[PDB]
Coordinates of C-alpha atoms and ligand atoms in Angstrom, one line a residue:
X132 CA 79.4 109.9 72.8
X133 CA 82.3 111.5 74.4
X134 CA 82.9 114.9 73.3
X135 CA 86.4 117.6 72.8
X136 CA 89.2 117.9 73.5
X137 CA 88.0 120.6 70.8
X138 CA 84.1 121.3 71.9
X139 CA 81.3 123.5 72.5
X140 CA 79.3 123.0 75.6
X141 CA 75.7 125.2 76.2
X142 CA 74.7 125.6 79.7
X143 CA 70.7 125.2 79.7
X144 CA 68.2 125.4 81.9
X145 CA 65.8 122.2 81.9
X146 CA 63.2 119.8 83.7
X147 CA 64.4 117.1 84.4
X148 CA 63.3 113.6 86.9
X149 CA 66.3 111.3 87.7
X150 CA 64.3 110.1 90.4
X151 CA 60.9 110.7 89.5
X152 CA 60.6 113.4 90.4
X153 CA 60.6 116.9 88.1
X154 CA 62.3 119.8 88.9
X155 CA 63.9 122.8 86.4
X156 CA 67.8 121.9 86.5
X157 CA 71.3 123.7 85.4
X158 CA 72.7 120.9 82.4
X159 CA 75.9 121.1 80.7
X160 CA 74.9 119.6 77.1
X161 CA 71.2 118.7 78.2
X162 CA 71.9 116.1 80.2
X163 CA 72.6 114.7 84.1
X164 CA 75.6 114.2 84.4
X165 CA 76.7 115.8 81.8
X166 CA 78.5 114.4 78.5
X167 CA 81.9 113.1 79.3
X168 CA 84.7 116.0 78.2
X169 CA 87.7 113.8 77.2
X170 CA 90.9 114.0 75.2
X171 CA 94.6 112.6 75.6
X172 CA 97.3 113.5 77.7
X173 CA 99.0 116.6 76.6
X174 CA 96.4 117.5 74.6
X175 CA 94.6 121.0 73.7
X176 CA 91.2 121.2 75.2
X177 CA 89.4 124.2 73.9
X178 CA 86.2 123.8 75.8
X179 CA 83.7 126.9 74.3
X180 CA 81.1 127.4 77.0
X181 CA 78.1 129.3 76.0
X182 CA 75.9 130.3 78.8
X183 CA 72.4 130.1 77.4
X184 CA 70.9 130.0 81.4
X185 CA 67.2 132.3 81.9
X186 CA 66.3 131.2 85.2
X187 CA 67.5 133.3 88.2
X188 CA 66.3 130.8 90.5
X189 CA 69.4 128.6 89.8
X190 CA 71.4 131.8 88.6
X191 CA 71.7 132.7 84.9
X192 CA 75.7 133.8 85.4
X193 CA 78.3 130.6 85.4
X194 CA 81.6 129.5 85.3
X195 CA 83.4 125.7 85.1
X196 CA 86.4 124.5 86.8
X197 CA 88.2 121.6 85.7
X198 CA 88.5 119.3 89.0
X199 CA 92.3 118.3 88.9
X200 CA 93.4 120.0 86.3
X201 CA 96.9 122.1 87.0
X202 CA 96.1 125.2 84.6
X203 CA 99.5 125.4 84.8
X204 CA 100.4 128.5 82.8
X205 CA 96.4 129.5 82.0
X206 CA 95.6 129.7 85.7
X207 CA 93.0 132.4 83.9
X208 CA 91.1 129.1 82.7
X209 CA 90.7 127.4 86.1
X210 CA 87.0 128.6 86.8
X211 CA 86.9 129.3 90.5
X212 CA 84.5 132.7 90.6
X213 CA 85.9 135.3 91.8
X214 CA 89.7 133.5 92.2
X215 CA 90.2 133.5 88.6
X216 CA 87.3 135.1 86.7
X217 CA 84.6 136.9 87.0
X218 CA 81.5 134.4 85.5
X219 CA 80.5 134.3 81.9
X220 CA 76.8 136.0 82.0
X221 CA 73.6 135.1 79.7
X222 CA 74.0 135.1 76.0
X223 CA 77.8 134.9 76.3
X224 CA 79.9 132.6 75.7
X225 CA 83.9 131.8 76.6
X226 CA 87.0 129.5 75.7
X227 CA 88.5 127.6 78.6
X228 CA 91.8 126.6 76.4
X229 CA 94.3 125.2 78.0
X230 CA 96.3 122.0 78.0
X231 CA 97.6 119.0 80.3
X232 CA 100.7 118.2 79.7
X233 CA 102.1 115.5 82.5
X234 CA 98.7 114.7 84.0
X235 CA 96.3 111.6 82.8
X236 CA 93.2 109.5 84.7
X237 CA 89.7 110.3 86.1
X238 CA 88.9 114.0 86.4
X239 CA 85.3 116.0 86.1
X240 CA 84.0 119.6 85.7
X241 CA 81.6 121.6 87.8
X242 CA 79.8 124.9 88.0
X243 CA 82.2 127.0 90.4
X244 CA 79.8 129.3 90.8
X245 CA 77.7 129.5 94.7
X246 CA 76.1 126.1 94.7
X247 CA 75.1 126.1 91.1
X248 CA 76.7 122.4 90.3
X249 CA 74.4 121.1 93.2
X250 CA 71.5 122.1 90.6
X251 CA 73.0 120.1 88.1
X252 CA 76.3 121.0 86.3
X253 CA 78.2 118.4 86.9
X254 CA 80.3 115.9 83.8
X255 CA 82.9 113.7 83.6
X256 CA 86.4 114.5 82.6
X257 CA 88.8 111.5 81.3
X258 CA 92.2 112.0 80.1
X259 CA 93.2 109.0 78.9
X260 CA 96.6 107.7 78.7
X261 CA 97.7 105.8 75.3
X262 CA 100.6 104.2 77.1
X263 CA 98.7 103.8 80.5
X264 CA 100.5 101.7 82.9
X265 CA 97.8 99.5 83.7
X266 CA 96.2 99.0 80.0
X267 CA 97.0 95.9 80.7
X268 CA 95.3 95.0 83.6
X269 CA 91.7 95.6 81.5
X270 CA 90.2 94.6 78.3
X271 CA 87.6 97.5 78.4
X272 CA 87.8 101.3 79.7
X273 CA 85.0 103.5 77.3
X274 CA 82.1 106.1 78.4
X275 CA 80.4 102.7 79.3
X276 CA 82.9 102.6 82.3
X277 CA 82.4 105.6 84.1
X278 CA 80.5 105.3 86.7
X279 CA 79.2 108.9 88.5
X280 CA 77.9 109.3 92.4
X281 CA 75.9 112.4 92.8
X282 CA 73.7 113.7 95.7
X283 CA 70.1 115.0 93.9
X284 CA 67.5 117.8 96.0
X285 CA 64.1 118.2 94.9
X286 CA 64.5 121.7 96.5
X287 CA 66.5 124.3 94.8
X288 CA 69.9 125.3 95.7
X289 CA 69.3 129.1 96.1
X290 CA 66.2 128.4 97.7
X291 CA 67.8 125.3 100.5
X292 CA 66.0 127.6 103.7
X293 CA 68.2 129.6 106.6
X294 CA 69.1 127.6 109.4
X295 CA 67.3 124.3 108.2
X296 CA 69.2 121.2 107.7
X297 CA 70.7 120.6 104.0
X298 CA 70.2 116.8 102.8
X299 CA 69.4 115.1 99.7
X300 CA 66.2 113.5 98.5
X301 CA 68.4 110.8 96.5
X302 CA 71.4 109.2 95.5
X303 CA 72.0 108.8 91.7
X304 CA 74.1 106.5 90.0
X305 CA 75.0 107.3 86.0
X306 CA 72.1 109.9 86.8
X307 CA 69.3 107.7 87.9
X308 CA 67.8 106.3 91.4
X309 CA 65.2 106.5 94.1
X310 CA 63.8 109.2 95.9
X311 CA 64.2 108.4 100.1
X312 CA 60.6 109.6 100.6
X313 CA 57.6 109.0 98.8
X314 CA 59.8 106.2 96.8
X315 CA 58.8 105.7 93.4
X316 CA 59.9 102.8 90.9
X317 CA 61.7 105.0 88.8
X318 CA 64.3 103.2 86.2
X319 CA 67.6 102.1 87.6
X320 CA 71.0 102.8 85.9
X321 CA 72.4 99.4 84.4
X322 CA 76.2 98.8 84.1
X323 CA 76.5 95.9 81.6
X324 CA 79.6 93.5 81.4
X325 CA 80.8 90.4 79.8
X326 CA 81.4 87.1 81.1
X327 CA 85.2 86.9 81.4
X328 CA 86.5 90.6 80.2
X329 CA 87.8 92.8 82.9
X330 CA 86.5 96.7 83.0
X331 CA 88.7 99.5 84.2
X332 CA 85.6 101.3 86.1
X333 CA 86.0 105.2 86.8
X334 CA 84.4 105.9 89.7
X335 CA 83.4 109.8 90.0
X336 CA 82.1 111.2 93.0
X337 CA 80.0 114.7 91.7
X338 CA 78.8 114.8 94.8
X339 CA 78.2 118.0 96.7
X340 CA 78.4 117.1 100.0
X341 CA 77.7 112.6 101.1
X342 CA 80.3 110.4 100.9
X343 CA 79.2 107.6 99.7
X344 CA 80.0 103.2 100.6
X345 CA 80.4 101.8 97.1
X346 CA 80.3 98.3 96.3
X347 CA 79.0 95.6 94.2
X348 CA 77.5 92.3 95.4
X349 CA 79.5 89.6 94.8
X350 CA 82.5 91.7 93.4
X351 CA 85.5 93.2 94.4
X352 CA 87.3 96.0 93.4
X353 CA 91.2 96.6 92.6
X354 CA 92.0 99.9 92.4
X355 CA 94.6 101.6 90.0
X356 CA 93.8 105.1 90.3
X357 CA 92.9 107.9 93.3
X358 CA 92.6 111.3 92.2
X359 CA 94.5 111.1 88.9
X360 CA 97.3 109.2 90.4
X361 CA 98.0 105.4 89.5
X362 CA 98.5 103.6 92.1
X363 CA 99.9 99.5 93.0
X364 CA 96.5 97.7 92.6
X365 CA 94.5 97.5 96.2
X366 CA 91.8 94.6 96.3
X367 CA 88.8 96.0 98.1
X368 CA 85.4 95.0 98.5
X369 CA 84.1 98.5 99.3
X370 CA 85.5 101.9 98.8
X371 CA 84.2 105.0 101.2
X372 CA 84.5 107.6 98.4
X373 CA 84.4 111.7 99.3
X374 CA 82.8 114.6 97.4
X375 CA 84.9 115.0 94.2
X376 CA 87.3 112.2 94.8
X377 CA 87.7 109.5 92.3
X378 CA 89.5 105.8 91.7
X379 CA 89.5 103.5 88.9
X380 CA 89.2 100.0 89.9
X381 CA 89.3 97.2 87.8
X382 CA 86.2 94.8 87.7
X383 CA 86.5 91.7 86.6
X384 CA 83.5 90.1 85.4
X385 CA 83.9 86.9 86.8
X386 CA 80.6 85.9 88.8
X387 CA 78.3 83.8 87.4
X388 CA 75.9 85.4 84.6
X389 CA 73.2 87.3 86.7
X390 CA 72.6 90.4 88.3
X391 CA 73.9 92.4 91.5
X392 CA 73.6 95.5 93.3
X393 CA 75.9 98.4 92.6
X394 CA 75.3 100.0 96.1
X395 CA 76.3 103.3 97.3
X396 CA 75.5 104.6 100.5
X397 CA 75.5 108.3 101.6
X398 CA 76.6 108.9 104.9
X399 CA 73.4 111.0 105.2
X400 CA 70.2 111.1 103.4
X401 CA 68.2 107.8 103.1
X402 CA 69.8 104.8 105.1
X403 CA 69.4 101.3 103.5
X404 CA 68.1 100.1 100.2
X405 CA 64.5 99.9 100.5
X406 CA 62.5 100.6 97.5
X407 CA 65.6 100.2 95.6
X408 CA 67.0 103.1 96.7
X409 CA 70.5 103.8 96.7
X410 CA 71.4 101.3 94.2
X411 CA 72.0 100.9 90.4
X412 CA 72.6 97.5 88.6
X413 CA 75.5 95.4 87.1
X414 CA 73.6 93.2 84.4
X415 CA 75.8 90.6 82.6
X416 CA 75.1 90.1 78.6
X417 CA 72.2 87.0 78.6
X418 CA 71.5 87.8 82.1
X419 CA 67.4 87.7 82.5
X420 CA 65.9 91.8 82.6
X421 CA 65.2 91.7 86.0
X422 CA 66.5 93.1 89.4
X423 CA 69.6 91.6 91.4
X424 CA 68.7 89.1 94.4
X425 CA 71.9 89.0 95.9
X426 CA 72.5 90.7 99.4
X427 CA 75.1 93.2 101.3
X428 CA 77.7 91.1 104.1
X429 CA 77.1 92.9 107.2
X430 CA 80.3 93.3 107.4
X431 CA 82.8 94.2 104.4
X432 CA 86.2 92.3 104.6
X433 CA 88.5 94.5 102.7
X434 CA 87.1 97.7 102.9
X435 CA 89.5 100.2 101.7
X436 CA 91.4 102.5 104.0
X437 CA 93.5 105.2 102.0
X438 CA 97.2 104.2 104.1
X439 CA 96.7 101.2 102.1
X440 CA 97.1 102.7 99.1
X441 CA 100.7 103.5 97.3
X442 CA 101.4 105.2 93.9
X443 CA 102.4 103.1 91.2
X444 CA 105.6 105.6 90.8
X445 CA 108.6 106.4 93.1
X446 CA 106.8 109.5 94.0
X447 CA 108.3 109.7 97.5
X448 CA 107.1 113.2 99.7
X449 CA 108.7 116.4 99.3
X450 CA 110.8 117.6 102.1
X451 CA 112.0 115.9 105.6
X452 CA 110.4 113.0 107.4
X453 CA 109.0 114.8 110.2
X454 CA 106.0 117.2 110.8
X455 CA 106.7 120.6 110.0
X456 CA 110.0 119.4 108.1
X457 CA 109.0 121.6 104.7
X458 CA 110.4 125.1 103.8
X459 CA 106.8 126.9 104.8
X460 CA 104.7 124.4 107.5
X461 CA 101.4 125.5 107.7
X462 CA 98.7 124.1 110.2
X463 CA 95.2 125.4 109.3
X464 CA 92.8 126.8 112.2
X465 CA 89.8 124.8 110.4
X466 CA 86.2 125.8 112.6
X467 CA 82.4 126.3 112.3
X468 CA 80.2 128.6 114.7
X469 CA 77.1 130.2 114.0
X470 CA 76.5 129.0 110.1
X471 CA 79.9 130.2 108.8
X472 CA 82.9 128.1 108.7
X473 CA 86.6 130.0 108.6
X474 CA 90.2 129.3 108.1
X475 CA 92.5 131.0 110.9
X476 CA 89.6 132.8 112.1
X477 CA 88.5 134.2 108.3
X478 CA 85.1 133.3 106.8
X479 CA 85.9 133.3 102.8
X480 CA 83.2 135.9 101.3
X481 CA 84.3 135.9 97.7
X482 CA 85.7 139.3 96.2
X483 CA 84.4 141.5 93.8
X484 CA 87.0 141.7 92.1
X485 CA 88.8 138.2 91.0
X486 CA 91.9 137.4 93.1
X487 CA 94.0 136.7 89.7
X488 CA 92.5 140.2 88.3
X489 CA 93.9 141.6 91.4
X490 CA 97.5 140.5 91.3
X491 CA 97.5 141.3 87.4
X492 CA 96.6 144.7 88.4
X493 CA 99.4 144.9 90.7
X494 CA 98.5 143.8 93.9
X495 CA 102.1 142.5 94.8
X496 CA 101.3 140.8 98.6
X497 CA 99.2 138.4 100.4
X498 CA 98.3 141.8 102.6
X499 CA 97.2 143.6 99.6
X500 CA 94.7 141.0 98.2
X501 CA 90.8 140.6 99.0
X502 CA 89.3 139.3 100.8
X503 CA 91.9 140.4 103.4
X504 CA 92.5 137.5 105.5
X505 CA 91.6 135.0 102.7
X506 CA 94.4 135.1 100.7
X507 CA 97.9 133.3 101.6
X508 CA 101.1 133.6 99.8
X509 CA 103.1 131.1 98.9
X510 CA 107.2 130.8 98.1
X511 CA 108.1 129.5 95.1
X512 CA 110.1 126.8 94.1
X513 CA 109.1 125.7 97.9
X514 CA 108.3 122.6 99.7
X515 CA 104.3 123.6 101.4
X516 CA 103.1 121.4 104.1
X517 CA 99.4 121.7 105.2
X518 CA 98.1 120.3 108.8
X519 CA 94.2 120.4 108.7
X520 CA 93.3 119.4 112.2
X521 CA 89.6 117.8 112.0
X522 CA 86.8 119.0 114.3
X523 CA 85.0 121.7 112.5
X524 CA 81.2 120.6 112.6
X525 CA 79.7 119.3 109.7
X526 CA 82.5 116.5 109.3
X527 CA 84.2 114.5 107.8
X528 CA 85.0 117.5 105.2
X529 CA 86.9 116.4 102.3
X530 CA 89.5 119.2 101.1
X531 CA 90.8 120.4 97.8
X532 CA 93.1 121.9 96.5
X533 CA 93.4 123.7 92.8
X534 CA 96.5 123.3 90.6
X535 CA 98.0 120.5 92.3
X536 CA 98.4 117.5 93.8
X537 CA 99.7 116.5 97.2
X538 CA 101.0 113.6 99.0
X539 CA 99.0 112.9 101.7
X540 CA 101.5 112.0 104.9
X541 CA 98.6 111.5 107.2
X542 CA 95.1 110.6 106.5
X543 CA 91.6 110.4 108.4
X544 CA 91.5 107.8 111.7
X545 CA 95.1 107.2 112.1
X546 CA 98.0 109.1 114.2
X547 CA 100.4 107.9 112.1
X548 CA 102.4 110.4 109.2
X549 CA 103.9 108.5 106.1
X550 CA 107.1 110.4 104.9
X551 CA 108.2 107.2 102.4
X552 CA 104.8 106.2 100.3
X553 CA 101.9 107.6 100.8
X554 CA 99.1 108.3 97.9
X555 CA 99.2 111.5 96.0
X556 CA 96.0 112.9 95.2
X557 CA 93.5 116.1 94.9
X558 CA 91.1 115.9 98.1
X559 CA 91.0 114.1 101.1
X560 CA 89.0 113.5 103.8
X561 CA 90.2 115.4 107.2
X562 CA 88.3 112.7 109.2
X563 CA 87.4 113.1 112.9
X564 CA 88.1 114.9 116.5
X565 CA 91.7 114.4 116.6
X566 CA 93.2 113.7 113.5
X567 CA 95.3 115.5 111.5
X568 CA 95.4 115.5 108.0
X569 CA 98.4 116.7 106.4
X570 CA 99.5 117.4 102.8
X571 CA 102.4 118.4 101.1
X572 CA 103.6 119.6 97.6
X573 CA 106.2 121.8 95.9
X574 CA 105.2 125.3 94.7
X575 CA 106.1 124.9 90.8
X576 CA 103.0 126.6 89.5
X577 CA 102.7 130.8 89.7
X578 CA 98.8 131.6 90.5
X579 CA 96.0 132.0 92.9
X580 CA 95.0 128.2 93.7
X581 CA 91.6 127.7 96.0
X582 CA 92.0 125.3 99.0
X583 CA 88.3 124.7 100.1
X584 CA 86.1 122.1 101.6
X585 CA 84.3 120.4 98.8
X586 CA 81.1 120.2 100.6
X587 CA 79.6 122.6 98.1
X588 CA 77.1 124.1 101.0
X589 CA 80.2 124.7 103.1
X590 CA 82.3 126.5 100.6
X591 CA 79.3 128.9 100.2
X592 CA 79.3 129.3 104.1
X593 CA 83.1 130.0 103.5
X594 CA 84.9 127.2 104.3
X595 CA 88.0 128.4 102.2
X596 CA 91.2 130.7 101.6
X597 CA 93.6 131.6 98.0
X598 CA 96.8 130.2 98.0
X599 CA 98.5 133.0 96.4
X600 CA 101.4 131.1 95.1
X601 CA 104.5 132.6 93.6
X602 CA 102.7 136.3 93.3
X603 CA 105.7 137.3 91.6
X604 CA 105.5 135.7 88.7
X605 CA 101.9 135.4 88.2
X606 CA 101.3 137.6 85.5
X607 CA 104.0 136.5 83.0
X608 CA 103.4 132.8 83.7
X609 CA 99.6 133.3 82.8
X610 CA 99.1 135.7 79.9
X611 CA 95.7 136.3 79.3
X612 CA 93.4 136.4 76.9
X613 CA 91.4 139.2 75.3
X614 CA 88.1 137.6 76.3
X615 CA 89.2 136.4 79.7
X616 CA 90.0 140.4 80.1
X617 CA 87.0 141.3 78.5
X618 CA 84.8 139.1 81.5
X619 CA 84.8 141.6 84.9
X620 CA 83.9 144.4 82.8
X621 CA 80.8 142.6 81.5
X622 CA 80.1 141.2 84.1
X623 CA 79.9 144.4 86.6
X624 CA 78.0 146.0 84.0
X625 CA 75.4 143.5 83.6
X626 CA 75.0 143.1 87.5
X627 CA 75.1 147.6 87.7
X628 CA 78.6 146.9 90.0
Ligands
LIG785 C1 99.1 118.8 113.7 O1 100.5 118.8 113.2 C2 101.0 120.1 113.4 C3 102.5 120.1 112.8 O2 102.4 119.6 111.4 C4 101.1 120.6 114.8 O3 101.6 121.9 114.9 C5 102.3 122.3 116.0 O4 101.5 122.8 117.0 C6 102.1 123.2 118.2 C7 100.9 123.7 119.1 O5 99.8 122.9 118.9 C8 103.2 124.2 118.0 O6 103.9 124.5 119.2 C9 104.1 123.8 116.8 O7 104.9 125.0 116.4 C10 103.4 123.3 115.6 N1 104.4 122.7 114.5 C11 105.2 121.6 114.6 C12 105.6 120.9 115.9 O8 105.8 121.2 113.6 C13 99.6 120.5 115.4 O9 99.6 120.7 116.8 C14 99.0 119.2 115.2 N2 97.6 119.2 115.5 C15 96.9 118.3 116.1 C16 95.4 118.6 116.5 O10 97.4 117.2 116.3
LIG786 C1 98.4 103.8 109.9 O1 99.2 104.6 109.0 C2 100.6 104.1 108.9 C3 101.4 105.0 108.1 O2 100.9 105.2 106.8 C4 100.6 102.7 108.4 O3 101.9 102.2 108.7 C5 102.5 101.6 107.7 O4 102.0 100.2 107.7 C6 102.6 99.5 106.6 C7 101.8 98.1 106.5 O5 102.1 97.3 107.7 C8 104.1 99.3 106.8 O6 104.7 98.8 105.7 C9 104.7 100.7 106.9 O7 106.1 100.6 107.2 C10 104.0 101.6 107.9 N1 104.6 102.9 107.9 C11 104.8 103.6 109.0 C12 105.4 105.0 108.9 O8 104.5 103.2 110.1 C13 99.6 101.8 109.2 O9 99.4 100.5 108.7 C14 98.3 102.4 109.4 N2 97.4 101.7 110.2 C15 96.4 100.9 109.8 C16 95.6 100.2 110.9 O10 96.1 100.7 108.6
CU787 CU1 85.9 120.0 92.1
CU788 CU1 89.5 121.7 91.8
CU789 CU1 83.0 120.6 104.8
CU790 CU1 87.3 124.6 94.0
F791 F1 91.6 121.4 90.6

C-alpha cells in the first residue's frame, strides 16, 4: 500500500538479502525500497520521521530530502544536512510538512545524510495528477507501476575502504536481483500486465552512482515524463537513465502472452545477464511461471537521446538565445584530483552549522556563509544560467539541483544549445571531455538550494556548492518551526559539539 500524504515513517535498522546475500541495512518503513510516499498535487504532506536507528556502522543520525520537490516557502523541510538542518538523532522524531503546489509526476526520497541512502533509505515519491495530461494515454498507473533501479553493496557504506575502487555487488529491480559474483538464484522481481491494457510505468532511478540501459524485450517505451515534467510522447526502445532521474513511459501490453526480460544495465558493476543477473521480469496474466526466453538486439534502434525529448507545455527557456544571455551566467570549474572533487577550485566539506541556520542568524552574504567558498548567491527574480563543462574523473556525473527545475539548453554528446524546446527537468547527465551541459531557471524561490553531483560517493568527496538564492528574503519566506529550531541544539549536544 501506498502511504501519506499524512504519515509516519520509522527509520530501522535491519537484515536484509535482496540478492541473497544478508547484510544489516538502513529501511524507511522495513522495507527496500521503501513504501511509496504519495498524495495529490497541492496537497499537504506531513511526513513524521522517527529515527529509531542503533547501529553506528550505517550512522544512527538521519535526515530525508524530497528529490524534486521545491520546498518552496519551507526550504527548512528540504533535508540536505547541514544546508537546511542539522539531522534528526536516535529516539527522535520530526515533521517534514510542507506542500506542492504546481508540481505533479515521479519523485522519490533519500537519506541526505553522508552516504547513508546507499545503505538502504531510499522510496518512491508519486504525486499524482487527477487531471493529468496523459491519463488518457493509459488504462493503469498504481504502486504496481513503479518500477525502481538501485545499485546494492554487500559492503557497508561507512566502511567502502580508502583509495579502493567503489562498485556494486548487484543491480536490483523493485528491490530484488543477482549478485555479479558468487551468483546465486535468488527470486527475480515480476512486473505483471494484461493482454491489451496499457501501463503508465514510473521509472525511478535510486541509484547512488550506475546509470543504468533499461529496456524490455520485445517492448518499447513512450515516454510522457522526465523529471516531473510531461513531456510530447518519445517512442524508445531503451532509455540510458542517471542516478535519481526518472521518466514515465507508457507500456503497452501488446506482445503475445509470455514472458521477457526487463533489463537494466549499470555502466559499471557486472556486465551482461549471466545467471540472471541484471534483470527482472515482465509476466503477462496466464503466462506459464517461468523465466523469459527472449533475447537483447545487439543493437537498440531508438534508443533515447534527451535532445529528443520536448515538454508537453510551451515552457520555452528563460532569457536570450545565446550562451551567457541570462541576467547572472555562471560556468562551473567542475574537477577531481587526489580523492576530492571541487567546484571553482572548493571541495564542499559540509558545515557545522546548517547554511539556512546561518542566514536565519544573520549571515547576510555569500562571503559570510560556511563553508567559505561553498556557498554562491544568487539574485532574485533573475534569469541563472549554469555551464558544467564535463571532464572531471569519475564521469558521466549526473547533476542536481534542489528547489527547482531547469531547462536544459545543452545536453551530454552534442555541441549544440536549444534556446526554443528543450526538456525541463531536475538532474542531468554532464556527459564527456568536451561537452557542456548548460541549465537555466529563474530565481523565484528565497533559500539555500544544493547543486551537487548525485553520485552519492562523489558528493561525500565534495562534489558540491549552496546556491544561496535570494539571501534577502530567506527568513520571512521560510518561517520555521519550533522543532526544526529545536534540531542543531540537539543535535550538537548529543554529538558533545
Ligand atoms: C561553456 O559555455 C560557456 C558559456 O556559457 C563558456 O564560457 C565562456 O568562456 C570563455 C573562456 O573559456 C570566456 O571568455 C567567456 O567569458 C565565457 N562566457 C560566454 C562566452 O558566454 C565556456 O568556455 C564553455 N566551455 C566549454 C568547455 O565549451
Ligand atoms: C543536437 O542538439 C540539437 C539541439 O537540441 C538538435 O537540433 C535540433 O534538431 C531538431 C530535430 O531535427 C530540429 O527540429 C531543431 O530545429 C534543432 N534545433 C537546433 C537548435 O538546431 C539535434 O537534433 C541534436 N543532434 C542529434 C544527433 O540528435
Ligand atoms: Cu535526490
Ligand atoms: Cu534533490
Ligand atoms: Cu559525479
Ligand atoms: Cu541533494
Ligand atoms: F530536489
Amino acid at each position: 500500500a501506498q502511504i501519506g500524504p499524512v504519515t509516519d515513517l520509522h527509520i530501522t535498522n535491519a537484515n536484509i538479502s535482496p540478492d541473497g546475500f544478508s547484510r544489516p541495512a538502513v529501511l524507511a518503513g522495513g522495507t527496500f525500497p521503501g513504501p511509496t510516499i504519495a498524495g495529490n498535487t497541492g496537497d499537504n504532506f506531513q511526513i513524521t520521521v522517527f529515527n529509531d536507528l542503533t547501529d553506528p556502522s550505517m550512522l544512527t543520525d538521519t535526515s530525508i530530502h524530497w528529490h524534486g520537490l521545491f520546498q518552496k516557502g519551507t526550504n527548512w523541510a528540504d533535508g540536505p544536512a547541514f544546508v537546511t538542518q542539522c539531522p534528526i538523532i536516535t529516539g527522535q522524531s520530526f515533521d517534514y510538512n510542507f506542500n506542492v503546489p504546481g508540481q505533479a509526476g515521479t519523485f522519490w526520497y533519500h537519506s541526505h545524510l553522508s552516504t547513508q541512502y546507499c545503505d538502504g533509505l531510499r522510496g518512491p515519491f508519486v504525486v499524482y495528477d487527477p487531471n493529468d495530461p496523459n491519463a488518457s494515454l493509459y488504462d493503469v498507473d498504481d504502486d504496481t507501476t513503479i518500477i525502481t533501479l538501485a545499485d546494492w553493496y554487500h559492503t557497508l557504506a561507512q566502511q567502502e575502504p580508502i583509495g579502493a575502487a567503489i562498485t556494486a555487488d548487484a543491480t536490483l529491480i523493485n528491490g530484488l536481483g543477482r549478485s555479479f559474483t558468487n551468483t546465486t538464484a535468488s527470486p527475480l522481481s515480476v512486473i505483471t500486465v494484461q493482454s491489451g491494457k496499457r501501463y503508465r510505468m514510473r521509472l525511478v532511478s535510486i541509484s547512488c552512482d550506475p546509470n543504468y540501459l533499461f529496456s524490455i524485450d520485445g517492448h518499447d517505451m513512450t515516454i510522457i515524463e522526465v523529471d516531473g515534467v510531461n513531456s510530447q510522447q518519445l517512442t524508445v526502445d531503451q532509455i540510458q537513465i542517471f542516478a535519481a532521474q526518472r521518466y514515465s513511459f507508457v507500456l503497452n501490453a501488446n506482445q503475445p502472452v509470455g514472458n521477457y526480460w526487463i533489463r537494466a544495465q549499470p555502466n559499471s558493476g557486472g556486465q551482461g545477464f549471466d545467471g540472471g543477473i541484471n534483470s527482472a521480469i515482465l509476466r503477462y496474466e496466464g503466462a506459464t511461471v517461468e523465466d523469459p526466453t527472449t533475447t537483447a538486439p545487439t543493437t537498440f534502434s531508438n534508443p533515447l537521446v534527451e535532445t529528443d525529448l520536448h515538454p508537453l507545455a510551451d515552457l520555452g527557456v528563460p532569457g536570450q538565445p545565446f550562451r551567457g544571455g541570462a541576467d547572472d551566467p555562471l560556468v562551473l570549474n567542475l574537477a577531481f584530483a587526489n580523492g576530492r572533487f571541487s567546484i571553482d577550485g572548493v571541495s564542499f566539506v559540509p558545515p557545522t552549522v546548517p547554511v539556512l541556520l546561518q542566514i536565519l542568524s544573520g549571515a547576510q552574504n555569500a562571503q559570510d556563509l560556511l563553508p567559505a567558498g561553498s556557498v554562491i548567491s544568487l539574485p532574485s527574480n533573475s534569469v541563472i544560467e549554469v555551464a558544467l563543462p564535463a571532464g572531471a574523473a569519475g564521469g558521466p556525473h549526473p547533476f542536481h539541483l534542489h528547489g527547482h527545475n531547469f531547462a536544459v539548453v545543452q545536453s551530454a554528446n552534442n555541441a549544440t544549445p536549444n534556446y526554443v524546446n528543450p526538456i525541463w527537468r531536475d538532474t542531468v547527465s554532464i556527459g564527456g571531455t568536451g561537452d557542456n551541459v548548460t541549465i537555466r531557471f529563474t530565481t523565484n524561490n528565497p533559500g539555500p538550494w544544493f547543486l551537487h553531483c548525485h553520485i552519492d560517493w562523489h558528493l561525500e568527496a565534495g562534489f558540491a556548492i549552496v546556491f544561496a538564492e535570494d539571501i534577502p528574503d530567506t527568513a520571512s519566506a521560510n518561517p520555521v518551526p519550533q522543532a526544526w529550531s529545536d534540531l542543531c541544539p540537539a543535535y550538537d549536544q548529543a554529538h558533545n559539539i
